[PDB]
UniProtKB/Swiss-Prot annotation, chain C:
Annotated function: Baseplate protein that is located next to the tail tube (inner baseplate). Involved in the tail assembly. The gp25-(gp6)2-gp7 module is involved in sheath contraction.
Quaternary structure annotation from Swiss-Prot or TrEMBL: Homodimer; each gp6 molecule in the ring interacts with its two neighbors, forming an N-terminal dimer with one and a C-terminal dimer with the other. Heterotrimer with gp7; gp6 is part of a (gp6)2-gp7 heterotrimeric molecule. The (gp6)2-gp7 heterotrimeric molecule further interacts with gp25 and gp53; the gp25-(gp6)2-gp7 module is involved in sheath contraction.
Superkingdom to which the source organism belongs: Viruses
Name by which UniProt lists this protein: Baseplate wedge protein gp6
Regulation: induction: Expressed in the late phase of the viral replicative cycle.
Residues of the full protein shown: 390 to 445 of 660
Length: 324, 52, 56
């Protein structure tokens, strides 16, 4: 870690706020250094080529350390703060600002650091701490791993470094392109029907394993031969429809206890071409309210840039027959 | 007569992230004399990096 | 288990080195020492001790 990270952390301390090295058991030979810009999220490919070009500075001929951006774990927070009407001078809009700062001040200080961790109980005491009028808060978290490629998990897998619950793992939705014509003079003569779809996990087996299955289809546009046939279990979360779509299929699988997640859309004869996205986001409920980082993973609150991962509900109180 | 007891306990869980006491009501914590109203389950954690 | 638990101390997540006891090769020795009566003060039992130390 610090053996080489620190140096770098000297010649570049004006940008990078977090640097640590690690190996991949598997990508033998390769040493990577994750670095987080103090100034946001991803170092720029120019900022990255400069930093790599101090590798020559310190003479090493062997292929030498790949710099790269950190594997972020995000907390989708659903915050609720109840406050006293009397004791609150400015706008609700102000108050939010006042606390959404506190959250960040906790993250920067105690969390946004390698192998340091997020404790929901701590940041809530930060929230409480934001005004002299913030009587008490509560909070509900999710974990977000932002997936680089939707089509197949890495060679190795995707892991949260944390225990999730059953059926918990679920990506967002991405358009699948069937291939049929719609024949609609509204928009010409042909739209190419494309219905949303997601990738969810099902319940632990006898032995700790689930199945990573992929959202609703219309019989025809997925070819089934004995082997590859519709999944049947109802041990997962189906999604809102308006269409006659209820045929989910099975790729990869979740090892709940070892938290590893592998899937590969290929397991059903569907080329990347068929989906109009390239990136997705995987969510899942933690088991605990204390969540952890490990090799090159970093937990981070970047809220003016990932605002989708915080929501604040306030509850103004006076006196009082009622706060819900 | 058909009931062994005299006193019982009435549990509800609030919608309140804040519980209000009020008239003659009083929120108290007497663990010694009311230990039943507190269970602590600890959990120990492995150390992280010790190496540098 | 103590010694293995410095493996965490120095951070490595991969399954990391198994400590274990050495594969011993032993020499069954059948020793014979001939000594001079005159020049030996203490017991034979002593002498043995004296040499069984030297071996070690």
């Amino acid at each position: 870690a610090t053996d080489y990270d620190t140096f770098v952390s000297e010649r570049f301390g004006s940008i990078i706020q977090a640097v640590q090295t690690f190996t991949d058991s598997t990508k033998p030979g390769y040493a990577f250094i994750a670095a987080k810009p103090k100034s946001g999220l991803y170092l720029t490919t120019v900022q990255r080529e400069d930093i790599k070009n101090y590798l020559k500075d310190y003479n090493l001929a062997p292929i030498t350390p790949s710099i790269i951006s950190p594997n972020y774990l995000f907390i989708k927070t659903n915050l609720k703060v109840t406050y006293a009407l009397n004791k609150l001078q400015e706008s609700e809009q102000w108050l939010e600002g006042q606390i959404i700062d506190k959250i960040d001040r906790y993250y920067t200080e105690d969390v946004e650091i390698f192998n340091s961790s997020f404790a929901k109980s701590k940041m809530l005491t930060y929230v409480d701490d934001a005004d002299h009028s913030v009587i008490g808060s509560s909070a509900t978290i999710q974990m977000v791993r932002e997936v680089q490629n939707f089509y197949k998990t890495p060679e190795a897998g995707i892991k949260y470094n944390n225990q999730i619950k059953d059926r918990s793992m679920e990506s967002n939705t991405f358009s699948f392109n069937s291939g049929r014509k719609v024949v609609n003079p509204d928009t010409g003569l042909e739209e190419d029907v494309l219905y949303d779809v997601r990738i969810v996990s099902t319940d632990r087996d006898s032995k700790g394993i689930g199945k990573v299955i992929i959202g609703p289809f219309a019989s025809g546009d997925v070819t089934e031969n004995e082997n590859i046939q519709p999944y049947t279990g109802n041990d997962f979360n189906k999604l809102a429809n308006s269409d006659g779509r209820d045929k989910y299929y099975v790729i990869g699988e979740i090892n709940y206890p070892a938290d590893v997640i592998y899937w590969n859309i290929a397991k059903i004869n569907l080329t990347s071409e068929k989906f109009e996205v390239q990136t997705i986001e995987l969510y899942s409920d933690p088991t605990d309210d204390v969540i952890f980082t490990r090799d090159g993973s970093l937990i981070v609150f970047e809220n003016d840039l990932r605002p989708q991962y915080l929501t604040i509900d306030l509850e103004p109180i006076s006196q009082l027959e009622h706060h819900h």
